[PDB]
Swiss-Prot record, chain A:
Disulfide topology: none
Keyword tRNA-binding in record: yes
Domain of life: Bacteria
Pfam families xrefs: Ribosomal_L16
Binding partners and assembly: Part of the 50S ribosomal subunit.
Family as reported in the entry's similarity comment: Belongs to the universal ribosomal protein uL16 family.
Entry GO terms, CC: cytosolic large ribosomal subunit
Species per Swiss-Prot/TrEMBL record: Bacillus subtilis (strain 168)
Record InterPro entries: Ribosomal_uL16, Ribosomal_uL16_bact-type, Ribosomal_uL16_CS, Ribosomal_uL16_dom, Ribosomal_uL16_sf
Protein name per the record: Large ribosomal subunit protein uL16
Keywords annotated in UniProt: Ribonucleoprotein, Ribosomal protein, RNA-binding, rRNA-binding, tRNA-binding
An individual GO BP term: translation
From Swiss-Prot, chain B:
SUPFAM superfamilies for the chain: Ribosomal protein L36
Pfam families reported for this sequence: Ribosomal_L36
Name assigned to this protein: Large ribosomal subunit protein bL36
Protein source organism: Bacillus subtilis (strain 168)
GO BP: any one term: translation
Keyword Transmembrane helix: no
Domain of life: Bacteria
From Swiss-Prot, chain D:
Gene Ontology CC terms, in alphabetical order: RQC complex
Region described as NFACT-N domain: spans on this chain: 1-172
Upregulation: Up-regulated under secretion stress conditions, possibly in a CssR/CssS-dependent manner.
Organism per entry: Bacillus subtilis (strain 168)
Record's protein name: Rqc2 homolog RqcH
Span covered, complete protein: 2 to 434 of 570
RNA sequence: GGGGCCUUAGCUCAGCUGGGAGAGCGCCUGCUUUGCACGCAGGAGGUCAGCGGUUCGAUCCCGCUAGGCUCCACCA
RNA sequence: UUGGCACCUCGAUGUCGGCUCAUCGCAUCCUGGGGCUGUAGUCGGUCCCAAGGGUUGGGCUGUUCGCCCAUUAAAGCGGUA
RNA sequence: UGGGGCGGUCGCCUCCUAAAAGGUAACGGAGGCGCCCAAAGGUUCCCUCAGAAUGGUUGGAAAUCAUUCGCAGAGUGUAAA
């Protein structure tokens, strides 16, 4: 379960998610990965769920590279209060994921094991996913 | 069983499309699935 | 309140 | 140990040693031990009033009871009420184990009011209670008791004293050369217990010493021994010594003719209680280990023997389940024969007639193959039992041999040998590090 | 709805911020005690309310459970 | 349902619970027809099709709700200021 | 004042929100000020900071001293640019 232990500011603007991925577009650590097709906030609970779902089915094999990190906090005002009167308290941490970005990286297993592990990870994520692999021109 | 995720459970399952509805028939009657 | 007590 | 006679000798010695005097300091370093710093004639004295559940005693100690921790509230009230005063007299309430301390203590406002401090040494019912000697209400007690728990003689601050119960005896000293025998009424030989429950404040040790001083116990070869020992107690003719037979120690104010082994002659009771004992600790360790360890080893040996007998029962159940497998294999083709017991079902020809002899239970049942299959499963469990119970019998005889050896090594030896036995055991096995 | 700390021996309950579950009370075993139910040692209980993650070991770290007791919810 | 906003009404839109009269939607309580059951039969569990009809008399509390007594084939959820 | 109350705030300075001139709101997000200094003011003349390593006796990770690598990782009274 992933969170920064110290931040410069505890309350930040929610930002915008226009455009493609700025970086982390190509798979370059593992052999196979998930490429994002839509943009939404990914909570660290979802990241933990996808990581356990991959790691359990890969009980024998290589390690998992988590390419995204939930650095941006989101604030949640308490329920049943009026609008305004100050910004609410921070509740959790999300990672801003753009389309084209690689989320998790797997090497050291077979093809179908990696495909099924990425499918089990993708069924926990709130975004449309696809299977990508390393290209060697090169 | 009626579910919107009609999938072949075993190797003997066969996917058919009766009446515009995706269905799975099998020798095992527990694998009979319909949607819609 | 809104008591209907018109006289 | 401990007793009204030893209490009388202690009162005589305290009247000889600390008469008048001044209580400069009151310390309570432990939960049951109270130290009085008596400044009597000559040098300073250190009176100890102990109310331990097993080691309760009153004597003038000489060693330094260190660790003066933060004092409890009974010690603080003792320093508030008793310190600065004088001791009038130390007397015993009859022949029971009750110590009365008369404290001529000046009050904190300046005037004088005599205080009576009561020390009771009854083993696990020992207590120290201070009264104001005019109304005899309890100012404070060392152990606080409720109206429910120990309903008689409730010890609360401000409650009236109730005084320990009457044992319904006669005073053993200066009684009569005839009163002593006109009430014990020896019939079948409970002599020491009759002395215990017919005399005031007498230990079973003094009764067992008196029945040895009588020699052959008779009608007259017993009261002259009791009067002789009471004359030895009176006129203050005590000979304090420590005697023991094996490890565990005994002390008394009179020389012991029974239960020999050691002499360790002493001068007074103060050095006697200083040397024995401190208070437990090694004696209480060999008390807590000695009988409990051998009891544990003997009980575990009985467990292992019962285990071996019940494992041999399963070894006979092995042959019973082999007969069950034979009867199931008889049933399996069956019902060749009628369902009942399916006995001797075999095909005359084109059959391998095992035709084993069988004992015929009625043959079950609703599910005709699963009964024979259940029999065959019981047989597989039986052969796995043939392996495991023989392993358990081997382990149980190894445990019984080791526990019989431990019984032998506990039933006396060395001291240093027991020390290195402990060493070897702890080595045997690693064992967090 | 918002916040706190626990839920561990038949009971009361420790355990220092991860280094291997304990004290008191209850129940037995043995010793000892002349005698007034006054003493000593030795045994069992716990999946640390429960569930899966982390690391070499988790009451301790984490989420969600399930509870208790906390301390309040200004209105028509 | 509890909320959020304050768009309509402050030259008046009467607000809870009951009584009387009802009507509508099934995300169906029973009755009707089925599939799978770790459905031997009765009784069951889950998921379909189905609103045609019927879905109670009390004790407590202003109470809806809730608890209990006795039945029933069942004593169904909601909308209509 | 996302009704009023209760709570909070009321003047000045710095950053973001502020959309590459300026300006720009919300009970939006972060902080400070109601001073201090006869010098920390003026002029003239010189010099360049913090950290790492090596070596040092009381010096150990750090008191003080030499060396390199140091365009500033220092300092600039007080706080942000």
């Amino acid at each position: 379960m992933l969170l920064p232990k110290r931040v410069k500011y505890r309350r930040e603007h929610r930002g915008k998610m226009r455009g493609r991925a700025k970086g982390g577009t190509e798979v370059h650590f593992g052999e196979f990965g998930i490429q994002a097709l839509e943009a939404s906030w990914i909570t660290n609970r979802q990241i933990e769920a996808a990581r356990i779902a991959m790691t359990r089915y890969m009980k024998r094999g290589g390690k998992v590279w988590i390419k995204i990190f939930p650095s941006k906090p989101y604030t949640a005002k308490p329920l049943e209060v009026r609008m305004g009167s100050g910004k609410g308290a921070p509740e959790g941490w999300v990672a801003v994921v753009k389309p084209g970005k690689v989320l998790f990286e797997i090497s050291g297993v077979s093809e179908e094991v990696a495909r099924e592990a990425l499918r089990l990870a993708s069924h926990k994520l709130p975004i449309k996913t696809k299977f990508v692999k390393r290209e060697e021109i090169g | 069983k009626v579910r919107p995720s009609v999938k072949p459970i075993c190797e003997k399952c066969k996917v058919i499309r009766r009446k515009g509805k995706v269905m799975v028939i099998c020798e095992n009657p527990k694998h009979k699935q319909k949607q819609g | 309140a809104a008591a209907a007590a018109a006289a | 140990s401990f007793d009204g006679m030893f209490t009388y000798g202690m009162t005589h010695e305290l009247n000889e040693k600390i008469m008048g005097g001044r209580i400069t300091k009151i310390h309570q370093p432990y939960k049951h031990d109270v130290i009085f710093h008596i400044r009597a004639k000559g040098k300073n004295q250190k009176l100890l009033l102990s109310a331990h559940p097993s080691y309760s005693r009153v004597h003038i100690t000489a060693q330094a009871y260190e660790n003066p921790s933060e004092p409890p509230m009974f010690c603080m009230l003792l320093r508030k009420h008793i310190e600065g005063g004088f001791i009038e007299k130390i007397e015993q309430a009859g022949l029971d184990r009750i110590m009365i301390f008369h404290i001529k203590s000046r009050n904190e406002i300046g005037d004088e009011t005599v205080r009576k401090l009561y020390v009771e040494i009854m083993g696990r019912h020992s207590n120290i209670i201070l009264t104001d000697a005019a109304e005899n209400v309890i100012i404070d007690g060392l152990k606080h008791l409720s109206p429910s728990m120990n309903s008689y003689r409730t010890v609360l601050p401000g409650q009236d004293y109730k005084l320990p119960p009457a044992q319904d005896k006669i005073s053993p000293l200066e009684a009569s050369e005839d009163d002593i025998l006109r009430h014990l009424s020896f019939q079948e030989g409970r002599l020491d217990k009759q002395i215990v429950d017919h005399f005031s404040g007498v230990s079973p040790l003094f009764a067992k010493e008196a029945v040895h001083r009588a020699g052959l116990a008779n009608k007259v070869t017993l009261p002259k021994a009791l009067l002789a020992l009471f004359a030895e107690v009176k006129e203050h003719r005590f000979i304090p010594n420590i005697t023991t037979v094996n490890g565990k120690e005994y002390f008394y104010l009179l020389e012991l003719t029974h239960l020999k082994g050691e002499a360790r002659r002493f001068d007074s009771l103060s050095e006697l209680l200083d040397r024995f004992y401190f208070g437990k600790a090694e004696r209480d360790r060999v008390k807590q280990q000695a009988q409990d360890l051998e009891r544990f080893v003997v009980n575990e040996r009985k467990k292992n023997a019962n285990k071996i007998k019940k494992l041999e029962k399963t070894l006979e159940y092995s042959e019973n389940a082999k007969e069950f497998q034979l009867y199931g294999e008889l049933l399996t083709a069956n019902l060749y024969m009628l369902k009942k017991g399916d006995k001797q079902a075999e095909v005359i020809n084109y059959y391998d007639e095992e035709s084993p002899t069988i004992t015929i239970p009625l043959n079950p049942n609703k599910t005709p193959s699963e009964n024979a299959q259940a029999y065959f499963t019981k047989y597989q469990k039986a052969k796995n039992s043939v392996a495991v119970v023989e392993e358990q019998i081997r382990l149980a005889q190894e445990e019984i041999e080791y526990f019989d050896q431990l019984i032998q090594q506990l039933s006396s030896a060395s001291p240093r040998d027991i020390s290195e036995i402990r060493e070897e055991l702890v080595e045997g096995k690693y064992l967090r590090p």
